[PDB]
Amino acid sequence: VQLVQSGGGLVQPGGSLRLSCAASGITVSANYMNWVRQAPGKGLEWVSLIYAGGSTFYADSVKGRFTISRHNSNNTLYLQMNSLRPEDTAMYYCARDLLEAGGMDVWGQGTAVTV
Amino acid sequence: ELVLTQSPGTLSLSPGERATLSCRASLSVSSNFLAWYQQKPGQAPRLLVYGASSRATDIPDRISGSGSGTDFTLNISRLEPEDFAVYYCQYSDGSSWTFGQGTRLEI
Amino acid sequence: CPFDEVFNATRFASVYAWNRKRISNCVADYSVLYNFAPFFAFKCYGVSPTKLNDLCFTNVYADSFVIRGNEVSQIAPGQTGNIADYNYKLPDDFTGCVIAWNSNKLDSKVGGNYNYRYRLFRKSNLKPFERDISTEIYQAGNKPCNGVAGVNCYFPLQSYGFRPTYGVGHQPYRVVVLSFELLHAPATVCGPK
């Protein structure tokens, strides 16, 4: 229905930036949520995905160095970075991509990595 | 395990004209797991079709979603100045979830 | 214990509401188990397949599905996926032998098949070896889905679709999962000789 997000910034390389995605009218505790990346001047690709149950999925390029957690008190979505590399400078969207739909996407923040 | 090639990479449509956009999987995949959706420059992507045979909400249903076998074609009947944006097609099997490369649309 | 009804049958259940037949207290014969054409997979996760003919077991259970080709690898004991986590989960301490079929001319009509279904939506994971018959509507949001689908509602059962010319994957693999659980009360044979 309506999902917002915030929590970006500029991060030194190898430092971890905590990413967030709140929601409104959508319970993230049981849904098909996934993240997508827009590197500048490039197309989209996977980031990660969390099932309604406690099963996650990762792209093989970004396997590891990642986590996805959904809080139960607040209906938000969280992913925490780890050991960041400077090819991850991109724009991150949290999504409600069902397998029989595309859901509602998000304004998204800009995560940049520079020295 | 797949690549999703979209041809052509650019298309020079004139306003008020029909548009045909097709993205072909590497294998003879099923139709019940691929979706096309818009992307405005700098904004959030918007859903267009699901399963390549239906429409989505808040859409005038003037976009034709078809495709059988390997060549999955999107047919656009009428177009407006607000609808010039790039198009991505996503395949989501459940074990392989490869993406596509967008096609820029302009006059 | 013929093992001739889970195999060579004209009826095969979907991933949800999967069939399950007990093979209790009869004369087993695993030498006939091999010759039903080269299987796509005959992985034996517990006992050795060559020693399984003459070893001592207990009550066994023979499951029966149809399963899409690219998701037959989610029958290993701990995997994540729609088939692995929502419809048919296997225990981590498995002792069975999953066997595929690679059927493409017997479970796929020319115009497609819609009586072969699988559940896509569930609000929680599945305990291993659990039948999951259900019809009622899923609710993905802050709105009750009383008796009608609708935005923020989906019918939690999707048809597979099995048309010819779909490839090695995307084709209905009949899957039998012969579990060999031991209950310390042996009834089947322990080596025909």
- What is the domain partition of chain B in residue ranges? 4-106
Task: Please tell me the distance from the alpha carbon of residue A91 to that of residue B42, in angstroms, as a whole number.
Answer: 10
Residue B68 CB neighbours (<10 A): 11
Enumerate the residues of chain C whose CB falls inside 8 A of the CB of residue B28: 165-167, 170
Select the residue from C68, C80, C118, C153 to test the A interface by mutation, using most A Cβ atoms within 10 A. Answer: C80
A57 touches chain C (CB under 8 A): yes
Residues preceding chain discontinuities in chain B with C to N over 2.5 Å: none
This structure's resolution (Å) is: 3.9
Domain C1-120+159-193 classification at class level: alpha beta
Helix, coil or strand: residue B12: strand
Q: What fold characterizes domain B4-106? A: Immunoglobulin-like (2.60.40)
* DSSP-derived pairing of the beta strands A10-11 and A109-113: parallel
Q: Which residue has the tokens 């590197």?
A: A39
State the number of CA atoms in the 13 A half-sphere of A106 facing the CB: 27
Enumerate the residues of chain C whose CB falls inside 8 A of the CB of residue A54: 125
Angle, alpha carbons A55-A59-B25 (nearest 5°): 110
Q: In CATH, what is the architecture of A10-101?
A: Sandwich (2.60)
Enumerate the residues of chain C whose CB falls inside 8 A of the CB of residue A55: 80-81, 85, 125
Domain borders along chain C are: 1-120+159-193
> Cα C124 to the chain's mean position, in Å?
20
Across the interface, whether the CB atoms of A45 and B99 are under 8 A apart is answered: yes
Across the interface, whether the CB atoms of B101 and A43 are under 8 A apart is answered: yes
Q: How was this structure determined?
A: cryo-EM
Task: Please tell me the distance from the alpha carbon of residue C51 to that of residue C190, in angstroms, as a whole number.
Answer: 11
Contact C40, C102 (CB under 8 A): yes
CA C21 vs CA A18, B67, B96, C30: distances in Å: 50, 41, 33, 17
Across the interface, whether the CB atoms of A107 and B43 are under 8 A apart is answered: yes
